[PDB]
Amino acid sequence: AEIGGDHGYNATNIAAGQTSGAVTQIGPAVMGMVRRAIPNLIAFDICGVQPM
């Protein structure tokens, strides 16, 4: 009676939407983007700061 079915928990199918029953999904959602943090700077005042 038209089971929902699900992806085989195989990343190849889950992104494409390949399902096991009916109603193949449009695609995955978007939970956001994460990016590597910017390293901080060490203050330059330790050495002489003479603008040339």
């Binding site: 038209e2 939407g17 009916a22 193949t24 449009i26």
Partner: protein
């Protein structure tokens, strides 16, 4: 049926019979008692979805 019909092809020979009143299309409604005896094989409807 198919006695006076000499056509070899099964499909066409069947088609000849429909016009000549030999056979009858049975697309027809069901008698009321068919869905009440608590043993009622009720036809199912299926759907599928594919993505292009």
């Amino acid at each position: 049926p198919f006695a006076t019909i000499e056509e070899s092809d099964l499909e066409l020979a069947l088609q000849i019979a429909i016009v000549l009143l030999k056979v009858r299309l049975f697309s027809d409604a069901a008698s009321t008692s068919k869905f009440e005896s608590s043993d009622s094989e009720i036809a199912d409807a299926r759907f599928q979805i594919n993505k292009w």
